[PDB]
Amino acid sequence: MHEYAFFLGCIAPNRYPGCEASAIKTSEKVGIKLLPLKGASCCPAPGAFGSIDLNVWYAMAARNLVLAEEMKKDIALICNGCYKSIWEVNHILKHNDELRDNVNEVLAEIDMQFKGTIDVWHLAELYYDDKVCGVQKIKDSVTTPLSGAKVAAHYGCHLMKPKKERHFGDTENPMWFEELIGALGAEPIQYRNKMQCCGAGGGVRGYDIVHALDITNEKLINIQEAGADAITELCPFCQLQFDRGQIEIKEKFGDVYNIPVLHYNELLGLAQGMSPQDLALDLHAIDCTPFLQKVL
Amino acid sequence: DWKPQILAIICNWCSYAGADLAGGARIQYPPTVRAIRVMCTGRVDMLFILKAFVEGADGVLVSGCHFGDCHYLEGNYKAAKRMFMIKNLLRNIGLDDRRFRMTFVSASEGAKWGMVMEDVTNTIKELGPSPIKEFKK
Amino acid sequence: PRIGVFVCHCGTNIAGSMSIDDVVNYAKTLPYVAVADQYQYMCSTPGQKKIDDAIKEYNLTGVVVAACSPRLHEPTFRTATKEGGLNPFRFEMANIREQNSWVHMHGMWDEATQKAKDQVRMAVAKAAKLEDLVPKSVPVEKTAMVVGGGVAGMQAALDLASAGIKTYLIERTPTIGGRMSQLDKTFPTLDCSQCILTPKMVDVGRHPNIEMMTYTEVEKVEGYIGNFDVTLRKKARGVLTPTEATAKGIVGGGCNGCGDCSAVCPVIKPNPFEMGMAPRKAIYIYHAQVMPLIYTVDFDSCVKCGLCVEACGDKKAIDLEMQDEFITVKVGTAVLATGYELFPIENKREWGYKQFDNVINALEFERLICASGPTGGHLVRPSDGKTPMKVGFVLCAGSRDNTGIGKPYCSRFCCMYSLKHAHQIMEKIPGAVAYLFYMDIRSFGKMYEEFYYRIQHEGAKFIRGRVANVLEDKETKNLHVFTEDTLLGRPVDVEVDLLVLAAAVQPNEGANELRKKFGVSASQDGWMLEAHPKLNPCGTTTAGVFLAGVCQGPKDIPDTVAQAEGAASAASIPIHMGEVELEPYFAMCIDELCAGCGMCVNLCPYSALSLGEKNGRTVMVVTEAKCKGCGTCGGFCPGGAIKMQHFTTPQIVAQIDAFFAG
Amino acid sequence: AAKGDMLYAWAKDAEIQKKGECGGAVTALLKHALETKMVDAVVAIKKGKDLYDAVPTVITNPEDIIQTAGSLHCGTLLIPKLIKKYLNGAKDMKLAVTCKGCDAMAFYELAKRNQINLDNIIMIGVNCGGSVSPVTARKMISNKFGVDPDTVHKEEIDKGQFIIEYEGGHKGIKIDELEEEGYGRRSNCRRCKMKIPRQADIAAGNWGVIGDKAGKATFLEICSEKGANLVNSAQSKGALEISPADPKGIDIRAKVEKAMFNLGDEWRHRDFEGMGKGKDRLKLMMSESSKCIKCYACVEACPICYCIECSTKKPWYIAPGVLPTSFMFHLIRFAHVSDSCINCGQCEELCPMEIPNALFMHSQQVEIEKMFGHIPGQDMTPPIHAFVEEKAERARLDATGTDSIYTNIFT
Ligand SMILES: Cc1cc2nc3c(=O)[nH]c(=O)nc-3n(C[C@H](O)[C@H](O)[C@H](O)COP(=O)(O)OP(=O)(O)OC[C@H]3O[C@@H](n4cnc5c(N)ncnc54)[C@H](O)[C@@H]3O)c2cc1C
Ligand SMILES: Cc1cc2nc3c(=O)[nH]c(=O)nc-3n(C[C@H](O)[C@H](O)[C@H](O)COP(=O)(O)OP(=O)(O)OC[C@H]3O[C@@H](n4cnc5c(N)ncnc54)[C@H](O)[C@@H]3O)c2cc1C
Ligand code: SF4
Ligand code: SF4
Ligand code: SF4
Ligand code: SF4
Ligand code: SF4
Ligand code: SF4
Ligand code: SF4
Ligand code: SF4
Ligand code: SF4
Ligand code: SF4
Ligand code: FES
């Protein structure tokens, strides 16, 4: 049973707690142990806080990293934006000496040092790796087939891009996340421009809601045209956009889709037999009941 | 009263070309190193280096082609093995082995030749006068 | 010994960095120096006259010139030393410009003067110990080899043969012609490629002075400028030419190219000439215009069914049990003309080359548009066989790219061939529109700008924007090309029926292996390197090897042919003379110091050293022709039994001693 | 009997078996080879005078090898260089040579450099726990043992102590105690670790012989097919008796060999740190080497020095008449020999000026060895500079993790 510190940023615990609950339960069912991070905070959200000040972005991400450093554990994440912040600041401060120095003399005011000893993983990346739980182990753990459901994957942008800074391979047409959805028994479908941004990154969600919603609506149109019955995602930002933004699209525009948006951990819980009440699917703006009727 | 005496033995086909290119491009560096110009660095016998160090070279530099880029297919592998062994001998006779180094400078690296010149001069200046000159007496 | 020291000013390039007067007075007070003197331009005729007058007056044994680099002016001053009654090799330079002045210009003058005095002292010390050498002259075999049967190889072979030298033309493939045989029409004149080349293919095939050896490779090369012992692998073609059949005893003949064999062969495989678009049997020719019309058998795919031999009948041209024969050929010079291949553009995933059906590259487009190709010359969509009406051309596909996937250089001809293809589609399909997504149209050659003007006049759309990514419509299989029109200032989404990628070119497959066999180095770009990038673009640093064609860097057919004839001329220079002088830097074994240990023998890359019998003692023997003067053996030998002719240990040690003299 | 067998061997002839130090198997094998005409001569050591004088001898009459029987512990000489100089390198005649570990290593060094013919030479190797200089042994016996040295009959290093047999009885003193007091084995013998010459054709010793044969049997290890043939021929013609060795004997032979390795390591340590470090080692080396009077005994005695004319004799390296000679003289030997020094000690012990040539050279050799991984004198592996390899050179440059040869090479 591999053990990881569970970073747990802002949106999953405070808006979609079923995501974190299913994360812990399903990760324990497969051979992974997710340990609470002691006093972790907002990973300085890369858009809304990196746009303001890169130095304080570095300092806060480094503080989050040195918490798990003192814990002597590897970070595990469930958010693409949190992955950007944590993993990328870890990678930058493992190689840039003057930035290490600057962050360290900022952190020395709170009796705290960064040395760069741990690694950062996304939970879906762990589920895909073969050393850690693999696709076959996921298939083994699945107990409810979830058959006869068309499911559209949204990769997001901060997990895989830029490919010159990550290690997940092709960004033009990846299929790895489609294999994790196929392990659950749901057939993943392909839609036009599947690698498009959801529109919520960089603080655009806050600065220009209509612009962000138009970017989201382009995706929703493509997904409905494909014929999806739900949208899996690996990011609480993207889930919030696809969930709230459907309501804001219904009100600001006149478009109705009613497409449930679920984190992959929530689908994994559904596959492994967790209850909808135990997943808190009532906390989503868009009702999941048609999808539950199909897969149950 | 003291100026470092550094001697370089540079091959004709990459290190001499690189030094010439640095000169042509007008890259300045201090005037402390004087060169010998053999055809390949395979020509450099160990006794050349040891003779330099016993005459009183504060430093010795041997510059040649990159591995795989010798004009004569493999003559700088022989030189590299010889200079590794020379580094070992100087360490065990108690002379400071950082007085000697072997750099691989291509025909197009005039800038790198200038940087090598500067770094060799700096290192020998830190090290100081060689001890042989007073140990002889 | 009596040495003269002549210090050049180089026209203030040296006098503006040091004190030439002080250097000259120091040279006068140096030991062994008879005369020291200075001049403004020692490389000029008054400078050589000054050297010669000094030699005659002062009875000089050797000459030291404190001037520019030896790599620039050894031949000049060696000839000046010869003219004057000395050996050319009693001369030594002291580089006090490119290694003293130009690097110690600013704010440091007496330091540069001291460096110059040191360099002059070391040069005088070496020259006081130099002695007479005579360059070795070696005979040159009167044959030549041309590796590559493309336009550059064929032009070089024809040029050498018509100059009268017997020539070998080695081609790995069963036919000569190269890429130009695959081209359909040619820019900027729109001539048919095969029509203009077939005359020259026939000339090569008929020339009595050319030994055309198709379907053959170069296993190994040893030797030098004089004699290159080149071993060739005659791959098992499986079919006999009439000459070989008569030699083996079959009077009725060999292969006449009737085609019955391929009419009955049941195996069907892709044709590499047609870039895989077209079928060909196990026994086959690339196209109907191949020069040796001899019908290779593909032994990796033949099932030995024996139908081909029954079809061939009494001609008996097919030998299904043939094996790779090896031949050793002695040649005087060699010309390398290996050409190029298209860079693998499936690595650029944003342009769905392998993943979308209707995305092709420019050689596949050229085969699709040729009238002899898999189609009847009709461009049709690969996805469904329908005629396109909008065609996009992605220029710079994988080129001028610093991301590590593509090539950082320009492929030279891809702007021109994309213009040609746009013209061809707009004239062959009525109402079709060509869109060129370009980033610097490069029409630099003769009539190229006029060709560009004419294409725009016929109505190709030029959108200045590098393509960002390509999406495939799920149903119509149409391709959505996304970029920005940089001049218009807006993003665009052009939906085309067919997308053509103008991919970069790279050195052919196996070219690095062949150039390592011949001893040629590579460029920064990865192409074969030339002797001097400006004034010698054909010859290489290894003597007797010359470059021709795209193998030295991408070029159009005109530039390729000019380069090929230049290489043929350079390869003919030593063959016509019949003599060639080697540089007397050889190793010479001093036998009554050799102990016969034999340890130096393995230190020679060229195998110039061996153990032999002289006066009962086993001593080492140098093949002075094979030696190249590197000095590895002579730097090894513990007993000092190997002497390097112009860089002897006493000379080098005298230089070291003079450096430490104060 | 076959290339790896470990045997007990003694001579059938009772007189040969008495005069052998152990069972006479080296003298029975040499006698058999000579008289059955495997070999045309035999190069062994005999006493020329008192047992402190060891004289090499080429023997062709099979009647003279009984005089060669017995081991002289004061025989500090080296045989293979004599075969190259005065027997034409054994290029035309077969020989059978009795040799210690240093003499086997020297055979292999000279055969690498093509100076002898190991196809012709047969090497019967003996175990060696150390040799004493004859004059130092005399002073040892006069002072520490309190005996007149001319009284001694035999003398041997057995169980790490120096047993002497004189008229009156026998005595014994620990060799470690003697070596602390300033006597004992030679310095290079204290540092030596070539205790069982497994590179020879046969290895004979008194280690591992236990029980009823503790002084009348030789432990033989057959180390090659040539030695197997010699032994089988001798046993069949009946000049030598063979019984398979005792497993307990094999075990304690291994233990004594291992303990000798450890002792050699300890002496290597204490000597090499006794030389100093940094500029102190340069003043030690330079002040010692300023004594050299250029007798060239070190060059003429070294097995690795095979050059017709030494570079130390060339006027562009060493000024011909300047007697307080340059440090270049010894730098030219460090450069040429230190990569393959077999620690024979001949250079140290033949120096009129008492310069620690072997100590300096071995101090350099041990870590040229741990750098390049080349053990001198074991087999036909070419010297490190006579065989340079492309892949290995890449490997040492990459291991430094550096673009040049400057640093990150040593710990
Ligand atoms: C799509 C496209 C269109 C083009 N259109 C034009 C045009 O319209 N006009 C124009 O002027 N130029 C055009 N060019 C450029 C033109 O093709 C080249 O200038 C020309 O072909 C160079 O010929 P080459 O002989 O140097 O090389 P190649 O034609 O490639 O010939 C090399 C030959 O050597 C052989 N070979 C390779 N390696 C070995 C080996 N190891 N041993 C033996 N043989 C070997 C190959 O099989 C081949 O036969 C075009 C290029 C492309 C890609
Ligand atoms: C200096 C020395 C130290 C030794 N130390 C040990 C030891 O610690 N442990 C051990 O087990 N064995 C040691 N031996 C070997 C020991 O003597 C063997 O047990 C013995 O050689 C067995 O042979 P043998 O009695 O059967 O034949 P022997 O009749 O003894 O034959 C001995 C052979 O050795 C030759 N010989 C004598 N002196 C020398 C010499 N100085 N150099 C070379 N050859 C010589 C003789 O000529 C003869 O051919 C040593 C030998 C020597 C010479
Ligand atoms: S010889 Fe060299 S330095 Fe002198 S004038 Fe000519 S180019 Fe200038
Ligand atoms: S049938 Fe025979 S002669 Fe005719 S093309 Fe085939 S191989 Fe040549
Ligand atoms: S043997 Fe059969 S498979 Fe081969 S070429 Fe002839 S017909 Fe074709
Ligand atoms: S020739 Fe034109 S299309 Fe080809 S790489 Fe250069 S600029 Fe791009
Ligand atoms: S020249 Fe030197 S290395 Fe070569 S065989 Fe003679 S002694 Fe040996
Ligand atoms: S100098 Fe020596 S090693 Fe080099 S090519 Fe000549 S003979 Fe061979
Ligand atoms: S050097 Fe070693 S093998 Fe030679 S006598 Fe001394 S201890 Fe024995
Ligand atoms: S043996 Fe001693 S004195 Fe004689 S040359 Fe060698 S070091 Fe000098
Ligand atoms: S240098 Fe001395 S100790 Fe080393 S092998 Fe030569 S003689 Fe023996
Ligand atoms: S020191 Fe060097 S040159 Fe002199 S004999 Fe020994 S190996 Fe030969
Ligand atoms: S040519 Fe420069 S190192 Fe060999």
PDB file of N, CA and C in Angstrom, chain D residues 75-96:
ATOM      1  N   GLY D  75      67.106 -15.438  -1.272  1.00  0.00           N
ATOM      2  CA  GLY D  75      67.194 -15.264  -2.727  1.00  0.00           C
ATOM      3  C   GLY D  75      66.238 -14.201  -3.157  1.00  0.00           C
ATOM      4  N   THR D  76      66.698 -12.968  -3.191  1.00  0.00           N
ATOM      5  CA  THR D  76      65.856 -11.834  -3.525  1.00  0.00           C
ATOM      6  C   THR D  76      65.977 -11.442  -4.985  1.00  0.00           C
ATOM      7  N   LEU D  77      66.368 -12.367  -5.843  1.00  0.00           N
ATOM      8  CA  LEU D  77      66.651 -12.030  -7.222  1.00  0.00           C
ATOM      9  C   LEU D  77      65.415 -12.242  -8.085  1.00  0.00           C
ATOM     10  N   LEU D  78      65.517 -11.827  -9.341  1.00  0.00           N
ATOM     11  CA  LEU D  78      64.416 -11.891 -10.286  1.00  0.00           C
ATOM     12  C   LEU D  78      64.951 -12.537 -11.554  1.00  0.00           C
ATOM     13  N   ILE D  79      64.336 -13.640 -11.963  1.00  0.00           N
ATOM     14  CA  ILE D  79      64.830 -14.515 -13.027  1.00  0.00           C
ATOM     15  C   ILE D  79      64.499 -14.070 -14.453  1.00  0.00           C
ATOM     16  N   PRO D  80      63.271 -13.631 -14.757  1.00  0.00           N
ATOM     17  CA  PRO D  80      62.903 -13.461 -16.170  1.00  0.00           C
ATOM     18  C   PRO D  80      63.744 -12.454 -16.924  1.00  0.00           C
ATOM     19  N   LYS D  81      64.216 -11.397 -16.273  1.00  0.00           N
ATOM     20  CA  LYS D  81      65.043 -10.440 -16.992  1.00  0.00           C
ATOM     21  C   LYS D  81      66.376 -11.058 -17.384  1.00  0.00           C
ATOM     22  N   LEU D  82      66.906 -12.010 -16.633  1.00  0.00           N
ATOM     23  CA  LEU D  82      68.153 -12.734 -17.024  1.00  0.00           C
ATOM     24  C   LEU D  82      67.931 -13.609 -18.262  1.00  0.00           C
ATOM     25  N   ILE D  83      66.773 -14.241 -18.389  1.00  0.00           N
ATOM     26  CA  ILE D  83      66.430 -15.074 -19.572  1.00  0.00           C
ATOM     27  C   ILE D  83      66.366 -14.201 -20.822  1.00  0.00           C
ATOM     28  N   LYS D  84      65.818 -13.003 -20.760  1.00  0.00           N
ATOM     29  CA  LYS D  84      65.815 -12.106 -21.934  1.00  0.00           C
ATOM     30  C   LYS D  84      67.236 -11.678 -22.305  1.00  0.00           C
ATOM     31  N   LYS D  85      68.047 -11.246 -21.349  1.00  0.00           N
ATOM     32  CA  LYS D  85      69.402 -10.719 -21.612  1.00  0.00           C
ATOM     33  C   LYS D  85      70.420 -11.762 -22.051  1.00  0.00           C
ATOM     34  N   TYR D  86      70.478 -12.928 -21.421  1.00  0.00           N
ATOM     35  CA  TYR D  86      71.557 -13.905 -21.699  1.00  0.00           C
ATOM     36  C   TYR D  86      71.060 -15.255 -22.229  1.00  0.00           C
ATOM     37  N   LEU D  87      69.773 -15.450 -22.440  1.00  0.00           N
ATOM     38  CA  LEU D  87      69.257 -16.708 -23.039  1.00  0.00           C
ATOM     39  C   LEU D  87      68.406 -16.365 -24.254  1.00  0.00           C
ATOM     40  N   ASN D  88      68.612 -15.197 -24.854  1.00  0.00           N
ATOM     41  CA  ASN D  88      67.885 -14.771 -26.081  1.00  0.00           C
ATOM     42  C   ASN D  88      66.380 -14.864 -25.889  1.00  0.00           C
ATOM     43  N   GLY D  89      65.884 -14.577 -24.699  1.00  0.00           N
ATOM     44  CA  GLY D  89      64.452 -14.517 -24.521  1.00  0.00           C
ATOM     45  C   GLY D  89      63.740 -15.824 -24.724  1.00  0.00           C
ATOM     46  N   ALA D  90      64.458 -16.941 -24.666  1.00  0.00           N
ATOM     47  CA  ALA D  90      63.877 -18.267 -24.853  1.00  0.00           C
ATOM     48  C   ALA D  90      63.118 -18.357 -26.168  1.00  0.00           C
ATOM     49  N   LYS D  91      63.664 -17.726 -27.205  1.00  0.00           N
ATOM     50  CA  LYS D  91      63.003 -17.708 -28.501  1.00  0.00           C
ATOM     51  C   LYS D  91      63.265 -18.960 -29.315  1.00  0.00           C
ATOM     52  N   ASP D  92      64.317 -19.708 -28.997  1.00  0.00           N
ATOM     53  CA  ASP D  92      64.648 -20.921 -29.722  1.00  0.00           C
ATOM     54  C   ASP D  92      64.666 -22.176 -28.866  1.00  0.00           C
ATOM     55  N   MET D  93      64.832 -22.059 -27.556  1.00  0.00           N
ATOM     56  CA  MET D  93      64.973 -23.209 -26.682  1.00  0.00           C
ATOM     57  C   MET D  93      63.878 -23.208 -25.629  1.00  0.00           C
ATOM     58  N   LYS D  94      63.315 -24.383 -25.376  1.00  0.00           N
ATOM     59  CA  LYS D  94      62.397 -24.553 -24.264  1.00  0.00           C
ATOM     60  C   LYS D  94      63.151 -24.558 -22.945  1.00  0.00           C
ATOM     61  N   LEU D  95      62.553 -23.925 -21.943  1.00  0.00           N
ATOM     62  CA  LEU D  95      63.087 -23.891 -20.594  1.00  0.00           C
ATOM     63  C   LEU D  95      61.996 -24.287 -19.619  1.00  0.00           C
ATOM     64  N   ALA D  96      62.409 -24.750 -18.446  1.00  0.00           N
ATOM     65  CA  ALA D  96      61.526 -24.910 -17.305  1.00  0.00           C
ATOM     66  C   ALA D  96      62.110 -24.087 -16.176  1.00  0.00           C
TER      67      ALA D  96
END
